[PDB]
């Protein structure tokens, strides 16, 4: 079972942090940004700490990690050039970073066309991962299913397999899959998965998910609003998501949590991980995690 979740990629020790922070929580995978999610500042692949990373993954049996691009990234943006060509140069050196990193997806939000229409953004989108897929490295780049909260392009499979039809070097491309956004576009994955992953297998391809988001969401299903729940405490619920872990179609992707901290306020927020794996691993629900978690 690869599961896992978003850990920190910061301070001097940086991947070997990630990797330790993995352990702690009983992680077989994980995900990082290469630095802060919210921004491009970054160090050299030097000072990512990378070596050291290796041999603590290699010593706790962690592998098939995933990379994910900075949030702020919108190459989907027709209107404001210096976003869009900043986008371009930083995943043209995300991809290099992520070679060196040895992971072999980075997770990228398709965009927002901020008011010039789908069919603008996604036609703006083509032309930048066109720009970026000139390299001839093997890093994909997984797009992410959307929510559809404001502009976001991504909210249905058609818009995905519109962006993969455009793209040369389309065999680049992959998606990762986010139970919280598909069901908040709308998509009955808490009651009809099954259903879900066959009209992805006809647009897309369930093949080409090569990594799982796992997210309760504090909405109900096509609330479009993105706000992600602890693993059974939001609309989706544990059989849903439980079912989802431990699906045959995911079998060697990496499933990992972006569930919320835990905590009485701001100042004491706790990560939920280690216990929504635990919770996860035995298929039971436990109605006290919150009250564990607040706690550790
Ligand atoms: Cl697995
Ligand atoms: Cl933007
Ligand atoms: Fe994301
Ligand atoms: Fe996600
Ligand atoms: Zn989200």
């Given at each position: 079972m690869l599961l896992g979740s978003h850990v920190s990629m910061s301070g001097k020790k940086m991947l070997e942090g990630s990797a330790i922070e993995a352990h702690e929580y009983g992680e077989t995978t994980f995900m990082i940004y290469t630095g802060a999610p919210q921004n491009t500042r970054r160090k050299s692949i030097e000072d990512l700490n990378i070596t050291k990373g290796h041999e603590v993954m290699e010593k706790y049996g962690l592998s098939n990690i995933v990379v994910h691009a900075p949030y702020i990234i919108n190459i989907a943006n027709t209107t404001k050039p210096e976003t869009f060509n900043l986008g371009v140069d930083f995943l043209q050196q995300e991809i290099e970073r992520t070679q060196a990193i040895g992971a072999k997806d980075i997770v990228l939000h398709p965009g927002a066309h901020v008011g010039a229409g789908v069919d603008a953004g996604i036609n703006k989108i083509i032309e930048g991962l066109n720009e970026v897929?000139?390299?001839?490295?093997?890093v994909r780049i997984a797009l992410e299913t959307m929510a559809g909260k404001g502009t976001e392009i991504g909210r249905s499979f058609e818009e995905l397999a519109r962006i993969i039809d455009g793209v040369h070097n389309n065999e680049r491309l992959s998606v990762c899959f986010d139970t919280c956004h598909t069901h908040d576009a709308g998509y009955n994955v808490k009651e009809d998965f099954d259903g879900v992953l066959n009209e992805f297998d006809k647009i897309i391809g369930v093949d080409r998910i090569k990594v799982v988001h796992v997210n309760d969401s504090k909405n109900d299903r096509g609330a479009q609003k993105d706000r992600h729940e602890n693993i059974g405490f939001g609309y989706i619920g544990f059989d849903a998501l439980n079912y989802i872990v431990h699906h045959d179609s995911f079998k060697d992707i990496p499933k990992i949590l972006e569930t919320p901290y835990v905590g009485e306020d701001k100042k004491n927020k706790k990560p939920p991980y280690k216990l929504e794996i635990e919770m996860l691993k035995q298929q039971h629900f436990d109605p006290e995690l919150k009250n564990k978690v607040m706690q550790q």
């Open positions: 897929l000139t390299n001839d490295n093997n």
